[PDB]
Amino acid sequence: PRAPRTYSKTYSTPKRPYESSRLDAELKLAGEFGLKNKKEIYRISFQLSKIRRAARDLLTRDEKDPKRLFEGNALIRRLVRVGVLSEDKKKLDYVLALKVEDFLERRLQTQVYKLGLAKSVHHARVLITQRHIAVGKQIVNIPSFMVRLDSEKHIDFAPTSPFGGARPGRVARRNAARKAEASG
């Protein structure tokens, strides 16, 4: 048969199903970052734990180790590029000390609200879902685009959509036809 296509999970559930503190914190994050489920928080926690485990197993290696050096530079540079790591500190201590809130605030869904195209994080959510958003010259409808500070300047509305011009809209066209009827 064909080769097996590999797939993997991207999230992990909490060990204790009903912890008041954890539930309150996760609901706070969901409300103040406009997330549909707690699966998003679980996913970001999963990636954060993965990179923290990588950083910890790096630190356990002695200094001037080629593996520790190379992997530290790779991980730190990737985190800096995405923007969850500081742009001036390659100490890797922050690599052992990132935060789920940092990852969430780096996600695109809040990036639209930050750059001021949304007026509300849930307006941003529906905007990206309805694809009135372009990361570059390409239209994205993924709330968790995880921008890299190189498209931060390039986030804008989609030219092939309203709020960007050249496109009235589905109900705007109906209203234009109604106004044509009314004007005669």
Binding site: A134, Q138, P159, T160, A166
Partner: protein
């Protein structure tokens, strides 16, 4: 054909099949999708070779519209194109006429019947008819 700007990338000219291959990208904003015949005729009038010596296939559209990328082939002459190009692509371009056959199941059943039959079978069929009649 307004700002269609069909353009080419990674051009390789191989005389081994007497042609050149390339990746052809069409930036067609305010356009659903440009058809294969339009792409091939514009590629022809751009490369100054011939209309039926050029070939286009693939052409996946970028998400959200705006651009399409596919693989393009142009040939040294229509004869070599008709020689090297696949039959299905020729039939799609209309340069070739598709052969008409039955279903694969019917073809295999026919092959099994005629492998049951040994030899030409005309004398056997005549003998069977004669014996059935009298």
């Amino acid at each position: 054909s307004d700002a269609v700007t069909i353009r080419t990338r990674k051009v390789i000219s191989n005389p081994l099949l007497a042609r050149k291959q390339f990746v052809v990208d069409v930036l067609h904003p305010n356009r659903a999708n440009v058809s294969k015949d339009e792409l091939r005729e514009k590629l022809a009038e751009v490369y100054k070779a011939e209309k039926d010596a050029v070939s286009v296939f693939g052409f996946r559209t970028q998400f959200g519209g705006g651009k399409s990328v596919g693989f393009g082939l142009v040939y040294n002459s229509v004869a070599e194109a008709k020689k090297f190009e696949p039959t299905y692509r020729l039939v799609r371009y209309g340069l070739a006429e598709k052969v008409e056959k039955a279903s694969r199941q019917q073809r295999k059943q026919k092959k099994n019947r005629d492998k049951k039959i040994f030899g030409t079978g005309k004398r056997l069929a005549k003998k069977v008819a004669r014996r059935n009649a009298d």
